[PDB]
């Protein structure tokens, strides 16, 4: 149980790019002396008479193992002991060897994985390997969770020719008492529960490999946590012995330039739904609130310098954009198509790709829109139009000759420069309820709002701002369309009341917003249920009480101070209380009489 040489592994599946020779050299360079593959092991497109002997050094794959479209006779993974299957091939496979043959049905004969004893997660699949010998004799039950071969091999089970390639059995022969794996059939032979492939003895220090984490020369279910439970305070303190996880290893410090997941693991880069920030002194991954930031070029910029409009051909390129550098221009030709360039008409529903757009730095010029839409719903999340464009007229917002009945620009809070023109929209109401000047950031900005539906005709039809709106007007008739609320709001909706004394989920009010009480707060009958966020601000706990905390269950095994665990029991009033220090697996009541 030591540190081992680590490599990254690949995620290319079945892609070929170069010559078989270049590809083979890439593999050789990658896995050279590699003992632990942090990712996947993809062995593809290796041809006959190529030497893959370096693969003999590989002992662990963290991801999946893919062996496909090879014609080489031998793949010598003789020392591969475990595939953890933390990533899957084809949505379900940790091990997949597929189609290792050419049109002559010649190819992979020898896959002597004589030390492969554990596949932690994932499935196994062998397909179309007409030259593969002996692997059909394997008893996979010993490995996966839920010539002829030597006569000495157990039940005719073997990975190859020799006695040395007889399958080693460490699970299915084990006594009924054993949790996990063994060295022999006796209850004396059982391995520690944390052992992965087999053991050299009964202890955590004896395991051949670890099921979860390796902290030094010991296997553990988890790494020493970064935070601790403090029984005196019922709160969480920093752990001075805490460690982060790096692959299946516990480490005091991440390698460079790695970052730390919320899960406390060391990774090279944060995930796609996340952003990075260093707080505090640690480079951390945090999940994005809303769509992750993404700047895209607008119409008349870069690749779109000679593009008339948003249209069928370019629309999907705005997918996930949150800020547009430059303009968005939408013109009648978008919806008509262009027959001469085979530009199809824009599918109206594709316009909802623009729902992620919160900012446009230039101008928003809308001169056409599908007639069956009643508002500019695609731009319901647009917050700012900066109007910085310097060579395309005076208007930063144009809404011209459309069929809409409301603007629906629910999130719009600033038009920093440029004039606004809203003209010729014969069904359009609500536009005069807005004090446009309050949106402006530049002296003298102007509006030109005319030849829309008449204000008096709108009033007479009931097309007015909702009763729950403030006097600041609205973007449509709904309580979500108000510029601001009469009083309280729940999310983006102006509402007549928060669920203080009645309704579910129960709430409190914070700066005129209805905020949900914590789920552990028990709803009170015609009386408030909480005074603030979280499980310490409840009037009454729904289940158990742990100090100031309303909790779902009492703490049971959590890491405490002095390198100990914390166990608690619940009394008749549902209050949590410390177990006696010597009930190291928990208790049902106070004292030694609590842990018989």
């Amino acid at each position, epitope marked *: 149980l030591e540190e081992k040489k680590v490599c990254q592994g690949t995620s290319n599946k079945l892609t070929q790019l170069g010559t078989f020779e270049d590809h083979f050299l890439s593999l050789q360079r990658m896995f050279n002396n590699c003992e632990v593959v942090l990712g996947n092991l993809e062995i593809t497109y290796v041809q006959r008479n190529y030497d893959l002997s370096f693969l003999k050094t590989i002992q662990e794959v963290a991801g999946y193992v893919l062996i496909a479209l090879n014609t080489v006779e031998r793949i010598p993974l003789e020392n591969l002991q475990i595939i953890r299957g933390n990533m899957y091939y084809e949505n379900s496979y940790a091990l997949a060897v597929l189609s290792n043959y050419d049109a002559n049905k010649t190819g992979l004969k020898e896959l002597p994985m004589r030390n492969l004893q554990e596949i932690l997660h994932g499935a196994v699949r062998f397909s179309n390997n007409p030259a593969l010998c002996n692997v059909e004799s394997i008893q996979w039950r010993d490995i996966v969770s839920s010539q002829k071969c030597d006569p000495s091999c157990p039940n005719g089970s073997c990975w190859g020719a020799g006695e040395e390639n007889c399958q080693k059995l460490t699970k299915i022969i084990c006594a009924q008492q054993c949790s996990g794996r063994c060295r022999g059939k006796s209850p004396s032979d059982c391995c520690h529960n944390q052992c992965a492939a087999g053991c050299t003895g009964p202890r955590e220090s004896d395991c051949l490999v670890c099921r979860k984490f390796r902290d030094e020369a010991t296997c553990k279910d988890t790494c020493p946590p970064l935070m601790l439970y403090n029984p005196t305070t019922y709160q969480m303190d920093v752990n001075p012995e805490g460690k982060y996880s790096f692959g299946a290893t516990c480490v005091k410090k991440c390698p460079r330039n790695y970052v730390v997941t919320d899960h406390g693991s060391c990774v090279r880069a944060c995930g796609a739904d996340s952003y990075e920030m260093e707080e505090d002194g640690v480079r951390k991954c945090k999940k994005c609130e809303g769509p992750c930031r993404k700047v895209c070029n607008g119409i008349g910029i870069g690749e779109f310098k000679d593009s*008339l409009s948003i249209n*069928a051909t370019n629309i999907k390129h705005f997918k996930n954009c949150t800020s547009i550098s430059g303009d968005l221009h939408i*013109l*009648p*030709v978008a919806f*008509r*198509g*262009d*027959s*001469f360039t*085979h*530009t*199809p*008409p824009l599918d109206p529903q594709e316009l909802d790709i623009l729902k992620t757009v919160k900012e446009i730095t230039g101008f928003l010029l809308i001169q056409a829109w599908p007639e069956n839409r009643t508002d500019l719903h695609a731009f319901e999340n647009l917050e700012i139009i900066r109007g910085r464009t310097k060579q395309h007229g005076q208007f930063s917002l144009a809404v011209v000759s459309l069929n809409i009945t409301s603007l629906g620009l629910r999130s719009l809070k600033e038009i920093s420069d440029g004039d606004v023109i809203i003209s010729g929209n014969k069904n359009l109401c609500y536009a005069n309820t807005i004090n446009w000047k309050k949106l402006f950031g530049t002296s003298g900005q102007k509006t030109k709002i005319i030849s829309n539906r008449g204000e008096n005709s709108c009033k007479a039809t009931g097309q007015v701002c909702h009763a729950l709106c403030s006097p600041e007007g609205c973007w449509g008739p709904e309580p979500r369309d108000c510029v601001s609320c009469r009083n309280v709001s729940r999310g983006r909706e102006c509402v007549d009341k928060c669920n203080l004394l009645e309704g579910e989920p129960r709430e409190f009010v914070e700066n005129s917003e209805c905020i949900q009480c914590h789920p552990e707060c028990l709803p009170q009958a015609m009386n408030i249920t909480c005074t603030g966020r979280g499980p310490d601000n409840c009037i009454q706990c729904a289940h158990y009480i742990d100090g100031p905390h309303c909790v779902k269950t009492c703490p049971a095994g959590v890491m405490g101070e002095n390198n100990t665990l914390v166990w608690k029991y619940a009394d008749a009033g549902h209050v949590c209380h410390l177990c006696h220090p010597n009930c190291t697996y928990g208790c049902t009541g106070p004292g030694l009489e609590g842990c018989p």
Partner: antibody, heavy 122, light 113 residues
Framework: EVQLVESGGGVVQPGGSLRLSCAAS????????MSWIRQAPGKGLEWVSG????????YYRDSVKGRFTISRDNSRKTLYLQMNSLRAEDTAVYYC???????????????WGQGTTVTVSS | DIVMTQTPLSLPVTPGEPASISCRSN???????????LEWYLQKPGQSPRLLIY???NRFSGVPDRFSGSGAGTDFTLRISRVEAEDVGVYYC?????????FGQGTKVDIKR
């Protein structure tokens, strides 16, 4: 029904000028791209020019470019081909044709006019 | 321009019998978007041209299944399973894939006697 009725054809000297008209009815004209196609005495069909429904862009066959101008007046549902600097090789029957498949996803033309004849000789 | 070659240029046909017209371009007609804009038009005597087939093998509305098209790349064929007397006229293949769009010279189908 959809109709396309052409006029304006006639006889003209080399270097002279004519203007063809194509009057549309029975559909919303401004929703459709339009083309002119011609057929000389001994040849097949030859595409000459095209324009978008709202005139945002026009297209011309090279041998015609700079001598012909395509245009449209959507308020009168009418398509035009202004022909100047007329050469002998321009003599043909000229058709207007509607791009029935918007954005040419399927096919180039559905409806055609009845044709108008242009003869250029001295 | 893409040259479209029709063979034959003259086709007497016996009514009730099959007929076939070949169209070959001097350049592949597969567009970058994946479609092949190869069309057949028929010009009946005293009438304007009218679309028969589009995208190689699709019959325009109103066109009977006696007409079919096939082919790919640079090689195409119009087939009439049984010719009717009302089918006489001039058939044109047409390419809308590359600029400028072009027609073949036209195959005149008439009556065999």
């Amino acid at each position: 029904e959809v109709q396309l009725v052409e006029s304006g054809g006639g006889v003209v000297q080399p270097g002279g000028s004519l203007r063809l008209s194509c009057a549309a009815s029975g559909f919303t004209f401004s929703d459709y791209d339009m083309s002119w196609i011609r057929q000389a005495p001994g040849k097949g069909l030859e595409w000459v020019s095209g324009i978008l429904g709202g005139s945002e862009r026009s297209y011309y066959r090279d041998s015609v470019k700079g001598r012909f101008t395509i245009s449209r007046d959507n308020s009168r549902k009418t398509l035009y081909l202004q022909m100047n600097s007329l050469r002998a090789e321009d003599t043909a029957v000229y058709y207007c044709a509607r791009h029935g498949s918007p954005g040419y996803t399927l096919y180039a033309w559905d409806y055609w006019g009845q044709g108008t004849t242009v003869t250029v000789s001295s | 321009d893409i040259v479209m070659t029709q063979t034959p240029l003259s086709l007497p046909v016996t009514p009730g019998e099959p007929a076939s017209i070949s169209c070959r371009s001097n350049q592949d007609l597969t567009h970058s978007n994946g479609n092949t804009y190869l069309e057949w038009y028929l010009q009946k005597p005293g009438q304007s041209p009218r679309l028969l087939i589009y995208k190689v093998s699709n019959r325009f509305s109103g066109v009977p299944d006696r007409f079919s098209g096939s082919g790919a790349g640079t090689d195409f064929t119009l087939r009439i399973s049984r010719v009717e007397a009302e089918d006489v006229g001039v058939y044109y293949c047409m390419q809308g894939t590359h600029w400028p769009w072009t027609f073949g010279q036209g195959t005149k189908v008439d009556i065999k006697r």
